[PDB]
Design a protein around this ligand. Structure first.
Ligand code: SAH
Ligand code: SAH
Ligand code: SF4
Ligand code: SF4
Lengths: 321, 320
């Protein structure tokens, strides 16, 4: 409901480092605060501000052109990714209480070893949730992150490393269906989604999602020409994979053309009129935004299946690691 | 039968022994992209990468793609800039413009006529000039500049070719923005001659200026402005943006610089400014005016709002 910007710390950093030019980058939900924050910086420091106006979907999406034009770029809403010279990551952790939703999920647990995952805006609250589940008699573990998702318990739409742990079931804390869906697909374990805003908890089963999707990607079985999508965004670029996929298509008597872009949208893909697309950019596009693409959009593994390169199986999660 | 663009592209690839080729197309030509890629990969040893971003003009080179390939072929626009490995395939129209020119002669009231057009028809202006002179007029074709390279060529952001000694203009092409721009920039009468429909009409900037007046009026009460800068290769005007911010403060207003690639209504809605000043493509300001959710002004209109320009002293926003 509210988010914590480290504003007094940002001002100190600017005044301490004597920055004269300061960049600001916000995910879409936080752009509503950009002008207010610019105002504070310009009124209380001698720096002048440039706000990034582009969509920003994550720490995978750094405005590197802006960073190369300022002394420091403050990037909000996301946990840091990569290692950039002058980019400072401002967490913006959420203050919503997750304990009621966790207790709500307790009566959906079957096993005794429970794992917890969440997104970055709640990772600071997992410790007290783990205490609650251990007080209810269960064992609880919070899996460690990797270089892409640094915080224990943190998952992304493209990274489920925190869910690779010695437990039997998971509780996902947060909103939406795609994160717990991905965890259930990645681990093949039971996942309860506990929404802290609604204080409701539901089992997220992947069988429906895998089954309907499998039947649909078989539409691409008959595709002859593929567009292989590559994004230039700072943390989504997979050109070497795209060139491997193009070679595998040719090996199997089909054709892929590499299409290089920044934003991946249906409007820009409709114009090319390939039979189907393979997405090497943000993998959440493939399973969410793709529902209203006019041609099939496949993960790299799904592409290999349609080609005959690998044997059929339900969709695995396309991870970036 | 002879594809002129494709044969030139293949010969260029063969001569320069390119192994990695980029293709960049504007919106209406992307439907040819895979077919051209297929020909290149079939008939040369090159691998092709297609730009998937929107492309609005030669002001909008995919420089990331250019730095990823041996040669980038950019379609639909006359060149601008000095990119070492970008080849411009102008994709010119072959329609006979002479019938529209003769139709425009009916509406002329002066003896000394200037000719302007877009890249589509620039190779046909010499013939049109010859026809206008043999029907009793004087005719001149103004020279362009480093941005609108061909004689008589105008862009939505460049009317240099219309700054020439004449009394009246014939614009050859479709759409009315360019001849309106010429009429406003020169204060001369402009006849617009559409060669596809073969018709000619006088353009009147009256409705256009009245519409711009409405956006100026709304922004007059704005306290906080977003000043838009684009990173596109030929649209970047950060120094202008910084000047406009200073003039805003001089006049008791506030402007914040916002740097972006694409300029869209959805992206401006996200920010809490009262109004915006656009230093990127000036056609954004006009074309999308009705879809923006706050007034979007040209730099000159911003000057009017702040009290630095007379409201009657409207000028076209040009990239020079
Ligand atoms: N290259 C790209 N082009 C267009 N949209 C993108 C994109 N990358 C991400 N997105 C958008 O951002 C959404 C993911 S954002 C929410 C996921 C979050 N980053 C996480 O991993 O936890 C996608 O559904 C898509 O709508
Ligand atoms: N940076 C940008 N972001 C979004 N749209 C842009 C843009 N630059 C140009 N456009 C789009 O492209 C349109 C101009 S297209 C016709 C202009 C042509 N290049 C000429 O000069 O003759 C604008 O109306 C706008 O809708
Ligand atoms: S799921 Fe997409 S938007 Fe989220 S971090 Fe991964 S690549 Fe970025
Ligand atoms: S009018 Fe806009 S799109 Fe056309 S050349 Fe000028 S800046 Fe580019």
């Amino acid at each position: 409901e509210q988010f914590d910007f480290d504003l007094e710390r940002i001002l100190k950093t600017i005044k301490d480092k004597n920055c004269k030019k300061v960049g600001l980058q916000f995910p879409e939900g936080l752009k509503r605060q950009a002008i207010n924050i610019a105002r504070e910086i310009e009124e209380k420091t001698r720096a002048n501000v440039i706000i990034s106006g582009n969509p920003c979907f994550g720490a995978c999406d750094i405005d590197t052109i802006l960073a190369g034009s300022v002394d420091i770029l403050f990037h909000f809403g996301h946990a840091g990714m990569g290692e950039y010279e002058n980019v400072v990551f401002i967490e913006a952790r959420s203050n919503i209480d997750i304990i009621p939703a966790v207790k709500t999920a307790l009566n959906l647990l079957k096993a005794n070893r429970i794992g917890l995952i969440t997104t970055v805006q709640h990772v600071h609250k997992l410790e007290e949730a783990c205490k609650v589940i251990k007080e209810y008699g269960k064992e609880c573990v919070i899996g460690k992150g990797d270089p892409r998702a640094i915080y224990p318990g943190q998952v992304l739409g493209c990274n489920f490393t925190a869910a690779r742990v010695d437990c039997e079931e998971f509780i996902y804390i947060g909103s939406g269906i795609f994160h717990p869906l991905g965890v259930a697909i990645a681990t093949k374990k039971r996942v309860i989604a506990a929404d802290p805003f609604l204080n409701q908890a539901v089992e997220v089963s992947p069988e429906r999602f895998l089954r309907k999707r499998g039947g649909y990607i078989a539409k691409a079985t008959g595709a002859k020409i593929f567009g292989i999508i590559v994004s230039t965004k700072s943390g989504q670029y997979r050109m070497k994979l795209a060139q491997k996929l193009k070679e595998i298509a040719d090996k199997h008597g089909k054709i892929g053309y590499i299409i290089l872009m920044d934003l991946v949208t249906p409007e820009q893909l409709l114009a090319f009129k390939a039979d189907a697309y393979v997405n090497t950019a943000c993998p959440r596009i493939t399973i969410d935004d793709a529902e209203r693409f006019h041609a099939p959009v496949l993960t790299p593994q799904e592409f290999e299946i349609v080609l005959g390169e690998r044997r059929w199986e339900n969709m695995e999660m396309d991870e970036m690691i």
